[PDB]
Amino acid sequence: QKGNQPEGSMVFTVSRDSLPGYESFGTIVITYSMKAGIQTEEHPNPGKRYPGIQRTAYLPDNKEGRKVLKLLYRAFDQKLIFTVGYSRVLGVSDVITWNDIHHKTSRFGGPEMYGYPDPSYLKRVKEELKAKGIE
Amino acid sequence: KGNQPEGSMVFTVSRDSLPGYESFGTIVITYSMKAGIQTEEHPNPGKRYPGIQRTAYLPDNKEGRKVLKLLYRAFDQKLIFTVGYSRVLGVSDVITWNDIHHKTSRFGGPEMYGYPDPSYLKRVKEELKAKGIE
């Protein structure tokens, strides 16, 4: 239902250029700009500061991509796109992290590079949103 | 020449404007950097670092396009990123910027690494000149 995402903003814009696998369409560019803050009782280490982050994600500008954009706005409103805590790979804590809804942060390079082509990505991200009760 | 990890730099444009640069579009630069193993040119040779993805923004005006061309040269000369200490993460052994500052937000001004910031394009050109890209 409702998460512990930091304060911040979500905006988007579009480019006429295409993503691999979606050559008939332009590209949605989502920018998240999240503020530095102090962990609340809603976070794993209350009282400890965390820095802000900035992240950009990409979607094809087609009916399905715009539906996912709408669902991501819903998740952002429900404070579910990001959380604060441990970041698995580096094993650092007290940082802003993603929250199990994967975003393509590269245009190209396929899944190895968190980019396109990735023909099942839109289906996968919808599954991840549904797991948060967002459909 | 620097010691930037393997990776790619691409750009595209949006018709929407950045604060302070009304009636020009927005250049969107995407950097896609591969995980790797530190070389002898890095601070901890032999240690692995994970890949990163970063997007940066510039106004699509004359000055912004000049900066884009210079950033392409810097990327070609392996100077945009390095591997080392990140104060944000509080660790080293990660892919970091290399003292060529990028705006990773559209909005929110300097505190958010975004626009408006009337002195940014001058600053980034100076930082490029410091690496001999001019």
XYZ file of N, CA and C in Angstrom:
807
model
N 0.815 -1.257 0.000
C 0.000 0.000 0.000
C 0.835 1.287 0.000
N 1.529 1.609 1.109
C 2.290 2.883 1.219
C 3.708 2.715 1.778
N 4.696 3.298 1.106
C 6.077 3.057 1.484
C 6.700 4.202 2.248
N 8.026 4.199 2.288
C 8.786 5.189 3.053
C 9.775 5.948 2.150
N 9.401 6.118 0.891
C 10.205 6.905 -0.046
C 10.570 8.288 0.500
N 11.814 8.750 0.236
C 12.216 10.096 0.604
C 11.395 11.155 -0.143
N 11.526 12.388 0.305
C 10.931 13.496 -0.433
C 11.622 13.649 -1.782
N 10.864 14.118 -2.766
C 11.475 14.376 -4.056
C 10.457 14.490 -5.140
N 10.914 14.563 -6.376
C 9.993 14.801 -7.506
C 10.168 13.759 -8.587
N 9.104 13.585 -9.359
C 9.097 12.734 -10.572
C 8.528 13.566 -11.704
N 9.292 13.682 -12.792
C 8.877 14.432 -13.982
C 9.179 13.566 -15.178
N 8.587 13.903 -16.319
C 8.974 13.173 -17.547
C 9.005 14.107 -18.734
N 9.680 13.650 -19.766
C 9.597 14.296 -21.059
C 9.734 13.217 -22.134
N 9.631 13.601 -23.400
C 9.711 12.600 -24.466
C 10.713 13.035 -25.532
N 11.316 12.047 -26.174
C 12.177 12.264 -27.343
C 11.532 11.541 -28.516
N 11.750 12.029 -29.745
C 11.259 11.343 -30.940
C 12.114 10.114 -31.296
N 13.314 9.994 -30.713
C 14.170 8.838 -31.013
C 13.605 7.570 -30.384
N 13.925 6.408 -30.963
C 13.331 5.141 -30.503
C 14.257 4.312 -29.634
N 13.656 3.399 -28.882
C 14.391 2.373 -28.141
C 14.385 1.124 -28.994
N 15.476 0.333 -28.945
C 15.501 -0.976 -29.614
C 14.305 -1.855 -29.235
N 13.635 -2.416 -30.247
C 12.431 -3.205 -30.065
C 11.146 -2.403 -30.189
N 11.267 -1.070 -30.164
C 10.117 -0.162 -30.245
C 10.391 0.937 -31.269
N 10.912 0.525 -32.420
C 11.356 1.441 -33.488
C 10.289 2.371 -34.065
N 9.017 2.011 -33.909
C 7.906 2.835 -34.404
C 7.539 4.011 -33.507
N 8.211 4.099 -32.358
C 7.794 5.005 -31.273
C 8.942 5.828 -30.748
N 8.616 6.958 -30.119
C 9.599 7.751 -29.387
C 9.977 7.168 -28.025
N 10.618 7.988 -27.195
C 11.149 7.519 -25.901
C 10.676 8.425 -24.787
N 10.092 7.831 -23.751
C 9.750 8.546 -22.503
C 10.986 8.546 -21.613
N 11.324 9.722 -21.091
C 12.466 9.915 -20.194
C 11.922 10.390 -18.854
N 12.060 9.566 -17.817
C 11.545 9.911 -16.464
C 12.712 10.366 -15.620
N 12.598 11.505 -14.932
C 13.690 11.960 -14.049
C 13.162 12.006 -12.631
N 13.834 11.257 -11.771
C 13.573 11.319 -10.314
C 14.660 12.117 -9.662
N 14.243 13.081 -8.867
C 15.187 13.955 -8.152
C 14.797 13.918 -6.667
N 15.550 13.130 -5.880
C 15.167 12.847 -4.496
C 16.068 13.596 -3.535
N 15.457 14.132 -2.494
C 16.173 14.999 -1.544
C 16.886 14.217 -0.470
N 18.037 14.745 -0.066
C 18.684 14.362 1.177
C 17.726 14.536 2.351
N 17.878 13.688 3.364
C 17.044 13.822 4.564
C 17.577 13.101 5.768
N 16.701 12.957 6.769
C 17.010 12.218 8.002
C 16.023 11.080 8.127
N 16.528 9.871 8.334
C 15.659 8.730 8.505
C 14.665 8.942 9.657
N 13.420 8.538 9.379
C 12.274 8.651 10.284
C 12.133 7.326 11.009
N 11.131 7.238 11.891
C 10.782 5.962 12.499
C 10.269 4.965 11.461
N 9.922 5.465 10.274
C 9.494 4.615 9.148
C 10.666 3.963 8.420
N 11.898 4.323 8.787
C 13.099 3.830 8.115
C 13.898 2.944 9.039
N 14.836 2.162 8.478
C 15.545 1.153 9.275
C 16.540 1.679 10.318
N 17.012 2.916 10.158
C 17.986 3.510 11.062
C 17.571 4.951 11.453
N 16.457 5.105 12.218
C 15.956 6.448 12.515
C 17.019 7.393 13.048
N 17.023 8.614 12.534
C 17.975 9.612 13.001
C 19.209 9.828 12.134
N 19.534 8.856 11.279
C 20.737 8.913 10.445
C 20.413 9.588 9.120
N 21.301 10.476 8.701
C 21.141 11.203 7.458
C 21.400 10.269 6.264
N 20.771 10.594 5.147
C 21.064 9.968 3.846
C 21.177 11.097 2.810
N 22.065 10.941 1.802
C 22.130 11.956 0.731
C 21.015 11.771 -0.308
N 20.830 12.763 -1.164
C 19.803 12.639 -2.223
C 20.345 11.801 -3.355
N 19.491 11.493 -4.317
C 19.975 10.826 -5.517
C 19.201 11.412 -6.676
N 19.707 11.155 -7.872
C 19.048 11.547 -9.117
C 19.133 10.344 -10.029
N 18.002 9.939 -10.591
C 17.992 8.763 -11.460
C 17.069 9.051 -12.630
N 17.440 8.557 -13.810
C 16.625 8.713 -15.036
C 16.294 7.335 -15.604
N 15.027 7.116 -15.942
C 14.549 5.856 -16.529
C 13.933 6.074 -17.897
N 13.882 5.008 -18.680
C 13.424 5.103 -20.092
C 12.319 4.090 -20.355
N 11.325 4.528 -21.124
C 10.196 3.691 -21.593
C 9.890 4.021 -23.042
N 9.355 3.046 -23.812
C 8.906 3.441 -25.163
C 7.641 4.281 -25.101
N 7.526 5.247 -25.992
C 6.376 6.137 -25.998
C 5.251 5.521 -26.848
N 4.710 4.411 -26.356
C 3.594 3.754 -27.014
C 2.488 3.566 -25.966
N 1.378 2.925 -26.327
C 0.245 2.811 -25.393
C 0.696 2.090 -24.125
N 1.441 1.013 -24.290
C 1.856 0.244 -23.120
C 2.839 1.000 -22.241
N 3.789 1.674 -22.870
C 4.748 2.491 -22.124
C 4.079 3.621 -21.371
N 3.073 4.257 -21.976
C 2.356 5.347 -21.288
C 1.511 4.777 -20.142
N 1.015 3.554 -20.283
C 0.281 2.905 -19.174
C 1.249 2.643 -18.032
N 2.438 2.124 -18.336
C 3.449 1.932 -17.284
C 3.827 3.272 -16.621
N 3.946 4.351 -17.406
C 4.245 5.673 -16.829
C 3.166 6.061 -15.823
N 1.894 5.856 -16.193
C 0.802 6.127 -15.295
C 0.913 5.292 -14.013
N 1.240 4.002 -14.145
C 1.393 3.129 -12.975
C 2.569 3.528 -12.099
N 3.651 3.976 -12.728
C 4.819 4.471 -11.971
C 4.496 5.763 -11.220
N 3.710 6.651 -11.824
C 3.232 7.841 -11.086
C 2.415 7.440 -9.863
N 1.591 6.403 -10.010
C 0.782 5.884 -8.880
C 1.688 5.345 -7.785
N 2.715 4.597 -8.187
C 3.657 4.052 -7.216
C 4.420 5.161 -6.523
N 4.786 6.188 -7.283
C 5.500 7.348 -6.702
C 4.617 8.082 -5.657
N 3.313 8.184 -5.941
C 2.314 8.827 -5.061
C 2.155 7.988 -3.810
N 2.238 6.673 -3.970
C 2.160 5.774 -2.814
C 3.480 5.587 -2.094
N 4.492 6.354 -2.504
C 5.806 6.426 -1.842
C 6.518 5.070 -1.926
N 6.437 4.432 -3.108
C 6.943 3.059 -3.321
C 8.057 2.911 -4.342
N 8.449 3.970 -5.037
C 9.484 3.799 -6.084
C 10.846 3.612 -5.434
N 11.113 4.389 -4.379
C 12.362 4.248 -3.646
C 12.109 3.949 -2.174
N 13.143 3.459 -1.531
C 13.162 3.344 -0.088
C 14.520 3.849 0.426
N 14.763 3.730 1.729
C 16.062 4.069 2.322
C 16.504 2.848 3.100
N 17.741 2.426 2.872
C 18.312 1.353 3.718
C 19.521 0.776 3.041
N 19.648 -0.526 3.163
C 20.814 -1.200 2.674
C 20.781 -1.382 1.181
N 21.934 -1.124 0.562
C 22.108 -1.301 -0.872
C 22.928 -2.578 -1.056
N 22.307 -3.595 -1.639
C 22.812 -4.985 -1.597
C 24.235 -5.249 -2.155
N 24.464 -4.748 -3.337
C 25.724 -4.998 -4.046
C 26.967 -4.474 -3.312
N 26.921 -3.208 -2.891
C 28.067 -2.592 -2.211
C 28.075 -2.876 -0.734
N 26.911 -3.225 -0.207
C 26.787 -3.474 1.189
C 27.025 -2.164 1.898
N 26.462 -1.090 1.362
C 26.435 0.120 2.165
C 25.014 0.331 2.625
N 24.848 0.951 3.776
C 23.526 1.232 4.316
C 23.230 2.731 4.320
N 22.035 3.090 4.797
C 21.619 4.481 4.966
C 21.703 5.224 3.653
N 21.254 4.585 2.591
C 21.192 5.276 1.301
C 19.831 5.077 0.641
N 19.516 5.961 -0.312
C 18.301 5.782 -1.092
C 18.504 4.665 -2.079
N 17.566 3.728 -2.096
C 17.650 2.575 -3.042
C 16.352 2.439 -3.806
N 16.398 1.683 -4.892
C 15.171 1.219 -5.511
C 14.412 0.266 -4.558
N 13.187 -0.079 -4.932
C 12.269 -0.767 -4.040
C 11.515 -1.853 -4.802
N 12.283 -2.654 -5.537
C 11.752 -3.843 -6.242
C 10.849 -3.546 -7.423
N 10.946 -2.341 -7.980
C 10.282 -2.014 -9.245
C 11.443 -1.580 -10.136
N 11.809 -2.459 -11.068
C 13.018 -2.221 -11.877
C 12.771 -1.187 -12.967
N 13.693 -0.236 -13.048
C 13.691 0.790 -14.088
C 14.892 0.631 -15.019
N 14.626 0.819 -16.315
C 15.669 0.815 -17.333
C 16.373 2.152 -17.283
N 17.616 2.148 -16.802
C 18.351 3.390 -16.610
C 19.340 3.614 -17.771
N 19.325 2.708 -18.754
C 20.074 2.866 -19.998
C 19.123 2.781 -21.174
N 19.439 3.496 -22.247
C 18.665 3.344 -23.474
C 19.043 2.041 -24.192
N 20.343 1.786 -24.332
C 20.870 0.681 -25.152
C 21.620 -0.355 -24.294
N 21.977 -1.474 -24.918
C 22.838 -2.446 -24.262
C 22.148 -3.687 -23.746
N 20.816 -3.694 -23.828
C 20.017 -4.834 -23.389
C 20.083 -5.031 -21.882
N 19.517 -6.151 -21.391
C 19.409 -6.334 -19.933
C 20.731 -6.285 -19.175
N 21.828 -6.706 -19.810
C 23.135 -6.668 -19.113
C 23.452 -5.257 -18.647
N 22.969 -4.271 -19.419
C 23.265 -2.867 -19.207
C 22.053 -2.103 -18.679
N 21.022 -2.821 -18.236
C 19.779 -2.228 -17.773
C 19.180 -1.340 -18.871
N 19.260 -1.811 -20.118
C 18.741 -1.046 -21.247
C 17.962 -1.931 -22.202
N 17.661 -1.386 -23.374
C 16.886 -2.100 -24.402
C 17.835 -2.610 -25.514
N 17.430 -3.634 -26.295
C 16.129 -4.268 -26.325
C 15.926 -5.199 -25.132
N 14.686 -5.296 -24.698
C 14.317 -6.240 -23.672
C 12.832 -6.494 -23.850
N 12.488 -7.473 -24.708
C 11.084 -7.591 -25.120
C 10.081 -7.869 -23.997
N 10.508 -8.480 -22.894
C 9.583 -8.754 -21.810
C 9.595 -7.727 -20.697
N 10.421 -6.691 -20.812
C 10.524 -5.725 -19.700
C 9.177 -5.112 -19.317
N 8.405 -4.618 -20.288
C 7.157 -3.951 -19.873
C 6.236 -4.917 -19.094
N 6.152 -6.170 -19.528
C 5.414 -7.199 -18.799
C 5.971 -7.374 -17.368
N 7.304 -7.445 -17.239
C 7.943 -7.657 -15.934
C 7.666 -6.523 -14.991
N 7.809 -5.293 -15.475
C 7.619 -4.131 -14.573
C 6.138 -4.070 -14.124
N 5.210 -4.402 -15.021
C 3.795 -4.495 -14.608
C 3.584 -5.535 -13.516
N 4.306 -6.669 -13.595
C 4.200 -7.726 -12.558
C 4.697 -7.152 -11.241
N 5.797 -6.399 -11.289
C 6.389 -5.830 -10.063
C 5.477 -4.788 -9.446
N 4.805 -4.003 -10.285
C 3.804 -3.014 -9.802
C 2.558 -3.702 -9.189
N 2.076 -4.755 -9.846
C 0.991 -5.564 -9.322
C 1.336 -6.154 -7.951
N 2.591 -6.545 -7.751
C 2.996 -7.102 -6.463
C 2.897 -6.071 -5.341
N 2.895 -4.785 -5.708
C 2.657 -3.661 -4.776
C 1.185 -3.247 -4.733
N 0.335 -3.959 -5.463
C -1.102 -3.663 -5.497
C -1.488 -2.592 -6.491
N -0.632 -2.377 -7.487
C -0.831 -1.295 -8.462
C -1.027 -1.886 -9.844
N -2.254 -1.827 -10.357
C -2.521 -2.338 -11.700
C -3.514 -1.518 -12.507
N 44.893 11.276 -21.557
C 43.961 10.090 -21.520
C 43.743 9.578 -20.088
N 42.489 9.297 -19.737
C 42.166 8.846 -18.393
C 42.006 7.341 -18.340
N 41.319 6.871 -17.309
C 41.193 5.435 -17.054
C 39.740 5.041 -16.828
N 38.850 5.777 -17.474
C 37.456 5.470 -17.474
C 37.182 3.999 -17.804
N 36.237 3.366 -17.067
C 35.773 2.019 -17.406
C 35.194 1.897 -18.820
N 35.045 0.671 -19.312
C 34.387 0.480 -20.598
C 32.945 0.965 -20.517
N 32.439 1.479 -21.626
C 31.052 1.929 -21.622
C 30.734 2.782 -22.813
N 29.506 3.261 -22.848
C 29.041 4.038 -23.988
C 28.394 5.356 -23.585
N 28.444 6.303 -24.515
C 27.796 7.614 -24.361
C 26.899 7.832 -25.563
N 25.621 8.125 -25.306
C 24.646 8.470 -26.356
C 23.905 9.726 -25.950
N 23.233 10.350 -26.921
C 22.382 11.490 -26.579
C 21.114 11.480 -27.424
N 20.112 12.168 -26.909
C 18.907 12.466 -27.646
C 18.411 13.840 -27.174
N 17.316 14.320 -27.765
C 16.815 15.644 -27.474
C 15.332 15.524 -27.132
N 14.865 16.415 -26.263
C 13.434 16.608 -25.971
C 13.121 18.060 -26.343
N 11.882 18.359 -26.760
C 11.511 19.750 -27.023
C 11.238 20.557 -25.762
N 11.117 19.894 -24.622
C 10.845 20.628 -23.379
C 12.098 21.361 -22.938
N 11.911 22.471 -22.233
C 13.028 23.367 -21.894
C 13.541 23.181 -20.483
N 14.819 23.506 -20.292
C 15.398 23.577 -18.957
C 15.203 24.969 -18.379
N 15.021 25.080 -17.046
C 14.959 26.409 -16.451
C 16.151 27.293 -16.805
N 15.870 28.533 -17.227
C 16.903 29.453 -17.669
C 17.243 29.415 -19.154
N 16.676 28.427 -19.843
C 16.939 28.168 -21.257
C 15.625 27.923 -21.982
N 14.694 28.845 -21.779
C 13.377 28.730 -22.377
C 13.477 28.861 -23.905
N 12.582 28.160 -24.602
C 12.521 28.097 -26.083
C 13.680 27.352 -26.767
N 14.449 26.603 -25.969
C 15.354 25.588 -26.484
C 14.959 24.273 -25.859
N 15.223 23.196 -26.579
C 14.968 21.859 -26.021
C 15.984 21.463 -24.974
N 15.975 20.176 -24.663
C 16.868 19.612 -23.617
C 17.627 18.488 -24.278
N 18.956 18.569 -24.248
C 19.838 17.452 -24.602
C 19.901 16.490 -23.397
N 19.661 15.205 -23.669
C 19.662 14.148 -22.646
C 20.805 13.230 -23.022
N 21.826 13.166 -22.158
C 23.007 12.321 -22.393
C 22.878 11.086 -21.520
N 23.030 9.894 -22.096
C 22.998 8.658 -21.293
C 24.349 7.985 -21.338
N 24.913 7.752 -20.160
C 26.174 7.012 -20.015
C 25.872 5.618 -19.435
N 26.385 4.583 -20.092
C 26.136 3.220 -19.709
C 27.474 2.521 -19.511
N 27.882 2.340 -18.250
C 29.276 1.947 -17.949
C 29.303 0.520 -17.435
N 30.242 -0.289 -17.958
C 30.308 -1.703 -17.651
C 31.034 -1.998 -16.338
N 30.542 -3.001 -15.622
C 31.317 -3.546 -14.507
C 32.689 -4.023 -14.991
N 33.667 -3.990 -14.102
C 34.998 -4.415 -14.469
C 35.886 -4.689 -13.287
N 37.138 -4.948 -13.591
C 38.154 -5.195 -12.566
C 39.164 -4.038 -12.625
N 39.428 -3.405 -11.484
C 40.416 -2.337 -11.454
C 41.768 -2.721 -12.011
N 42.311 -1.824 -12.835
C 43.627 -1.964 -13.438
C 44.684 -1.307 -12.547
N 45.928 -1.338 -12.990
C 46.997 -0.629 -12.273
C 46.800 0.894 -12.346
N 45.875 1.358 -13.195
C 45.615 2.803 -13.256
C 44.575 3.242 -12.225
N 44.026 2.277 -11.483
C 42.951 2.520 -10.516
C 43.499 2.373 -9.089
N 42.746 2.836 -8.075
C 43.356 2.883 -6.736
C 43.505 1.524 -6.070
N 42.744 0.514 -6.499
C 42.792 -0.772 -5.837
C 42.849 -1.855 -6.913
N 44.001 -1.990 -7.576
C 44.087 -2.948 -8.673
C 43.612 -4.357 -8.295
N 42.798 -4.919 -9.183
C 42.310 -6.276 -9.009
C 40.957 -6.416 -8.356
N 40.451 -5.345 -7.751
C 39.147 -5.352 -7.127
C 38.094 -5.027 -8.172
N 36.974 -5.719 -8.096
C 35.859 -5.465 -9.003
C 35.046 -4.251 -8.610
N 34.517 -3.569 -9.624
C 33.547 -2.498 -9.425
C 32.288 -2.830 -10.239
N 31.110 -2.448 -9.712
C 29.897 -2.680 -10.496
C 29.684 -1.629 -11.576
N 28.855 -1.976 -12.560
C 28.519 -0.977 -13.574
C 27.623 0.131 -13.017
N 27.536 1.224 -13.764
C 26.633 2.327 -13.409
C 25.982 2.860 -14.658
N 24.844 3.533 -14.459
C 24.192 4.252 -15.544
C 23.940 5.654 -15.011
N 24.202 6.651 -15.850
C 23.954 8.063 -15.447
C 23.355 8.779 -16.621
N 22.445 9.698 -16.341
C 21.921 10.581 -17.391
C 22.170 12.021 -17.011
N 22.616 12.822 -17.980
C 22.876 14.231 -17.759
C 22.090 15.086 -18.745
N 21.907 16.346 -18.369
C 21.048 17.273 -19.124
C 21.777 18.548 -19.460
N 21.526 19.063 -20.666
C 22.099 20.319 -21.156
C 20.997 21.012 -21.967
N 21.035 22.341 -22.032
C 20.102 23.016 -22.950
C 20.506 22.807 -24.410
N 19.517 22.659 -25.295
C 19.789 22.427 -26.707
C 19.900 23.765 -27.451
N 20.848 24.576 -26.999
C 21.181 25.835 -27.649
C 22.602 25.749 -28.161
N 23.125 26.847 -28.695
C 24.480 26.866 -29.229
C 25.523 26.444 -28.214
N 25.453 27.035 -27.024
C 26.420 26.750 -25.990
C 26.291 25.309 -25.513
N 25.063 24.840 -25.338
C 24.866 23.470 -24.854
C 25.391 22.445 -25.842
N 25.200 22.712 -27.142
C 25.701 21.815 -28.195
C 27.216 21.809 -28.258
N 27.836 22.971 -28.054
C 29.298 23.050 -27.926
C 29.772 22.180 -26.774
N 29.146 22.315 -25.609
C 29.504 21.472 -24.446
C 29.310 19.978 -24.754
N 28.223 19.627 -25.428
C 28.000 18.221 -25.795
C 29.169 17.685 -26.615
N 29.615 18.461 -27.607
C 30.730 18.038 -28.450
C 31.989 17.855 -27.623
N 32.204 18.734 -26.630
C 33.402 18.636 -25.774
C 33.307 17.425 -24.878
N 32.104 17.136 -24.359
C 31.902 15.959 -23.496
C 32.127 14.675 -24.288
N 31.702 14.655 -25.554
C 32.036 13.502 -26.405
C 33.528 13.289 -26.543
N 34.283 14.369 -26.763
C 35.742 14.276 -26.817
C 36.326 13.739 -25.504
N 35.879 14.292 -24.372
C 36.331 13.817 -23.059
C 36.028 12.332 -22.872
N 34.846 11.878 -23.295
C 34.469 10.466 -23.163
C 35.362 9.575 -24.036
N 35.647 10.067 -25.233
C 36.554 9.376 -26.146
C 37.976 9.270 -25.566
N 38.389 10.292 -24.817
C 39.689 10.332 -24.155
C 39.640 9.730 -22.752
N 38.542 9.029 -22.467
C 38.376 8.248 -21.224
C 38.465 9.104 -19.969
N 37.880 10.294 -20.009
C 38.013 11.269 -18.943
C 36.733 11.595 -18.174
N 35.585 11.081 -18.622
C 34.335 11.479 -17.940
C 34.204 10.772 -16.575
N 34.570 9.483 -16.519
C 34.515 8.759 -15.261
C 35.892 8.226 -14.870
N 35.987 7.847 -13.604
C 37.157 7.113 -13.104
C 36.641 6.082 -12.097
N 37.545 5.409 -11.381
C 37.136 4.511 -10.322
C 37.803 5.028 -9.059
N 37.028 5.138 -7.992
C 37.605 5.646 -6.766
C 36.553 5.910 -5.704
N 36.814 6.948 -4.920
C 36.070 7.249 -3.695
C 34.826 8.061 -3.996
N 33.684 7.556 -3.516
C 32.413 8.290 -3.620
C 31.965 8.776 -2.252
N 31.925 10.084 -2.032
C 31.450 10.569 -0.747
C 29.956 10.272 -0.526
N 29.185 10.232 -1.604
C 27.785 9.919 -1.432
C 27.607 8.509 -0.849
N 28.373 7.542 -1.378
C 28.260 6.148 -0.944
C 29.081 5.830 0.298
N 30.102 6.652 0.542
C 30.999 6.449 1.662
C 31.933 5.275 1.462
N 32.191 4.923 0.194
C 33.113 3.840 -0.128
C 33.920 4.192 -1.374
N 34.994 3.433 -1.584
C 35.751 3.559 -2.820
C 35.445 2.306 -3.666
N 36.272 1.973 -4.665
C 36.023 0.827 -5.542
C 34.714 0.943 -6.329
N 34.321 2.192 -6.658
C 33.113 2.433 -7.462
C 33.412 3.377 -8.602
N 32.588 3.316 -9.635
C 32.738 4.219 -10.755
C 32.192 5.612 -10.355
N 33.046 6.624 -10.466
C 32.687 7.977 -10.039
C 32.856 8.946 -11.191
N 32.234 10.123 -11.076
C 32.589 11.225 -11.970
C 34.048 11.601 -11.734
N 34.630 12.280 -12.711
C 36.078 12.603 -12.723
C 36.304 14.113 -12.806
N 35.603 14.874 -11.970
C 35.764 16.314 -11.916
C 35.349 17.111 -13.139
N 34.463 16.525 -13.936
C 33.734 17.221 -14.996
C 32.302 17.109 -14.525
N 31.759 18.204 -13.993
C 30.455 18.147 -13.333
C 29.309 18.068 -14.334
N 28.384 17.159 -14.059
C 27.178 16.960 -14.856
C 25.917 17.284 -14.043
N 24.899 17.768 -14.757
C 23.577 18.005 -14.175
C 22.754 16.770 -14.412
N 22.456 16.058 -13.327
C 21.748 14.783 -13.384
C 20.261 14.943 -13.056
N 19.824 16.192 -12.852
C 18.396 16.502 -12.711
C 18.035 17.591 -13.737
N 16.778 17.623 -14.167
C 16.279 18.729 -14.987
C 16.021 19.945 -14.102
N 15.355 19.715 -12.982
C 14.869 20.815 -12.158
C 15.557 20.850 -10.800
N 15.228 21.872 -10.019
C 15.626 21.927 -8.627
C 16.889 22.696 -8.325
N 17.538 23.232 -9.350
C 18.726 24.052 -9.134
C 19.953 23.289 -8.663
N 21.016 24.017 -8.290
C 22.263 23.395 -7.839
C 22.116 22.398 -6.714
N 21.222 22.627 -5.749
C 21.168 21.680 -4.619
C 20.744 20.272 -5.064
N 20.062 20.215 -6.206
C 19.542 18.952 -6.767
C 20.305 18.551 -8.016
N 21.447 19.185 -8.249
C 22.246 18.918 -9.457
C 21.416 19.158 -10.708
N 20.604 20.228 -10.671
C 19.698 20.548 -11.758
C 19.727 22.014 -12.103
N 18.773 22.413 -12.928
C 18.660 23.802 -13.370
C 17.491 24.441 -12.624
N 17.442 25.781 -12.558
C 18.360 26.720 -13.184
C 19.728 26.811 -12.523
N 20.741 27.076 -13.334
C 22.064 27.338 -12.791
C 22.828 28.129 -13.846
N 22.760 29.459 -13.741
C 23.225 30.299 -14.836
C 24.736 30.187 -15.058
N 25.480 29.702 -14.062
C 26.927 29.598 -14.239
C 27.418 28.184 -14.567
N 26.499 27.225 -14.741
C 26.926 25.823 -14.999
C 27.707 25.646 -16.325
N 27.211 26.183 -17.431
C 27.868 25.892 -18.721
C 29.291 26.453 -18.759
N 29.485 27.604 -18.127
C 30.826 28.180 -17.982
C 31.713 27.282 -17.103
N 31.156 26.799 -15.993
C 31.889 25.942 -15.066
C 32.359 24.654 -15.750
N 31.457 23.997 -16.477
C 31.793 22.711 -17.097
C 32.824 22.915 -18.223
N 32.725 24.026 -18.942
C 33.735 24.308 -19.956
C 35.117 24.483 -19.340
N 35.174 25.153 -18.192
C 36.446 25.359 -17.480
C 37.020 24.039 -17.009
N 36.150 23.136 -16.558
C 36.586 21.841 -16.056
C 37.124 20.982 -17.181
N 36.498 21.082 -18.351
C 36.977 20.425 -19.564
C 38.325 20.988 -20.004
N 38.455 22.313 -20.011
C 39.725 22.982 -20.336
C 40.866 22.513 -19.406
N 40.535 22.268 -18.141
C 41.497 21.750 -17.165
C 42.069 20.394 -17.576
N 41.321 19.638 -18.371
C 41.796 18.351 -18.864
C 42.299 18.504 -20.284
N 42.401 19.739 -20.748
C 42.910 20.024 -22.083
C 41.914 19.820 -23.213
N 40.629 19.701 -22.871
C 39.558 19.629 -23.869
C 38.943 21.021 -24.025
N 39.114 21.615 -25.201
C 38.790 23.017 -25.407
C 38.299 23.297 -26.827
